[PDB]
RNA sequence: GGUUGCGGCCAUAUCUACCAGAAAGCACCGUUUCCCGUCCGAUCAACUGUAGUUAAGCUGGUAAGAGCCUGACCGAGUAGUGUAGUGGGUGACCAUACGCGAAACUCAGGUGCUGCAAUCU
RNA sequence: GAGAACAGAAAUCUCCAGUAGAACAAAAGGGUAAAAGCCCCCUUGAUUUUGAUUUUCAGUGUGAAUACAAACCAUGAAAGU
RNA sequence: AAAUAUGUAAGAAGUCCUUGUUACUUAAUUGAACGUGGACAUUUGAAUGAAGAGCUUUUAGUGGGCCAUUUUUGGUAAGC
């Protein structure tokens, strides 16, 4: 009935791992009014630096 | 049976400090937050809209999303054998900036300044911190501080 | 002495606790209209007492608060019913005072043979000029100890006015 | 009371003990959208003392508020208004002065003239196309109670006529009938100029002819009759549009001779 | 330096009780025709700075004051507590070794500081 | 607490003190004083579209909440909500 | 208001200068986010260790547990 013996040893056998951050996190949870404009800003920056 | 509410076992955690009740002072609504700022989570029971859970009280996270009257933060949380990234939407009154970063930022500024000083002056400097080294040789003098002899103290009449 | 120091009258509230609710209540309303000129207001019941027969939220009493020049006129015609003989116990610790008459006809009104017979509660509160600092909204404050009105200053003003011979008992 | 009372007593804020600031109102007037990070949120502060009107434009930082532009009613003698400086028309002219002064400070006084020939209609400062948007200030009427026809909406009307884009509605201006839900512009214009003062002047000229002098003793001594108030306020508004820049009063002393005299009476330790 | 408007930190700012405020400001104050609101122009609204006053508000001093804040050869290296022993004791508990280490108290000191704009002998 | 005809322990009115000792539908805990309490006015955001997130958690469902987006509205002088 | 225990940070995905994008934001040629081009790339900004770091697929057994120190709750008390 919920004996927490051996659970920390089981947790620390295969390590307790960090979530492995990256550059460019996902824009799925951010403000959609900002994300809609950030799409157009990235597109305009790409079209500017393409013909340079 | 046992209960697991949203605010269970939270009697002392979400209560205002002694002689600190009432309205929130206006500095909290004027501190600005950008994406990437590291903030502490410290809820108050006065504003019930946008509270964190009782787990996240005291945890430090990184702002990922700024909108009207509330910021969203990212907190690693250990469940089982690994950490999960929890994204959570807090009002500003449960958020204080972390001053743990604003020693490192000013330290970067200071050592970049003295590194640019030394590399154009013609000397060598260290930029790493060091732990408390052992003490050095000193000659303790005896002019006013003549060593007063101490003795252990007896027990009778002290009782 | 000094201006902004005189115990000017502030308001005189006339009050009648009818105890019941009905035709004498509506009559006493017209009595206070014929006396004051202003329309009066009725008050509800705070609590419930079975032995006095009033329940929660029932209009039982009529009062009207008069100010300005007619307040001391009604005060004079109410004092000449008591023959200008007031007690010392009627004066409160904050310097306001009142009394109660048993017949409401002998003020100077005309008599009606149908509107009922009742007494009336006179109460008058007065203070020196400058008590807007408590009653206003922005920047409230309490009047100073030298400017507060007490029982001794009120009975001194009542002795100087009207040649009262207030009872000190 | 007790030691146990005074140890557990929590005093409120200082400008709440003084009774000067409503923090419940100030939170929502100052607190801004977090996605506009350092954008200042300007408040048109209108305050009424017993013989002066204070119209300031005020932003807010953590180290106290910051005044962008202020305009007082005791500089209206530079434009023509002498008597009745806590007037409805004087509140209008003060709001017009702070609007013209703020737009001259920013550089929008040529693009946003507002309305110049005022008839009392309800009209908001519409944005011009392919240019800058108008300056945006939010009015805050202190601890002052809002009633329809109050003086503090005269400064609102004056700022919106000067072209300061204060968002508002018409249902607190004088002349707004609560039955037809419509305003009377021929009454609002009569309050914008001197109509409700001048009408009382000509009524007291033949109803109580000494109380007329005891009220308008400055008007009779300065030879201002009832009908000239319109001509006073119109040329006053024209002078305000002409030169609204703020030049300070020339000081008698340079604030050290002031301090040397004020330290004499200050009763220090 | 005085004052006003808007403030920041929100008692070193509060509470209690006397005294003083030049100038300017603020305030009390004067009056209901109009906008407005009331049992009541008392609050609120409007008009006049005109008849008056520092009496109050406010500000500043004063107090073996209550509180509040700060500091330590204060309490005290005390209570508590992490680690160790085939330590002691029948036991409750205790001592020792390596560490961390309070609090109420006691004494001393203090009683708002400051930002923006305007104005004043 | 001090006062006022009947009127008192306890009906109505007036002043003074009053950091919440009241009230907030209901358990207990938290919160709240120009309010979140008490009165008054106007209303239907107790609405439409589906997403993201927190809690219990397998990071499944159910329940309940949180912050926005695109509409349409309410209220207020307004910021706002 | 401890002791023990606990979140985060200690840089190259960093810091600074300049000016490009945007339908977002601003009274605004303001800001936000992502950038271009330069500069610092020496101690790449505490200690110690690293016996490689990261990732994926698939599957067995298990899903009756007990004892000791310390804290503790029902319990007169236990090998409760």
Numbering used by the authors:
A (entry chain a): 6 to 57
B (entry chain T): 2 to 160
C (entry chain E): 6 to 174
D (entry chain P): 8 to 276
Provide the authors' original text about this structure.
In states I-III, the L1 stalk is displaced inwards with H38 in the ‘closed’ position. In addition, we identified density corresponding to the phosphatase and zinc finger domains of Yvh1 situated between uL11 in the P-stalk and eIF6 (states I-II). Focused classification around the P-stalk revealed that Yvh1 is predominantly bound in state I, is present at low occupancy in state II but is absent in state III. Although there is clear density for uL11 (state I) at the base of the P-stalk, uL10 was poorly defined in our maps, consistent with the paucity of uL10 protein in the Lsg1-TAP particles as detected by immunoblotting. While the overall structures of Rei1 and Reh1 are consistent with previous reports, our maps reveal additional density that corresponds to the N-termini of both Rei1 and Reh1 extending up across the surface of eL24 to directly interact with eIF6 subdomains C and D and with a loop that extends out from the α-helical domain of Lsg1 (residues G438-T456) (state I). The timing of the exchange of Rei1 for Reh1 (between states I-II) is consistent with XL-MS analysis that yielded crosslinks between Rei1, Arx1 and eL24, while Reh1 yielded crosslinks to eL24, but not to Rei1 or Arx1. Focused classification around the H89 density revealed that in the absence of eL40 (states I-II), H89 adopts a range of conformations even with Yvh1 present.
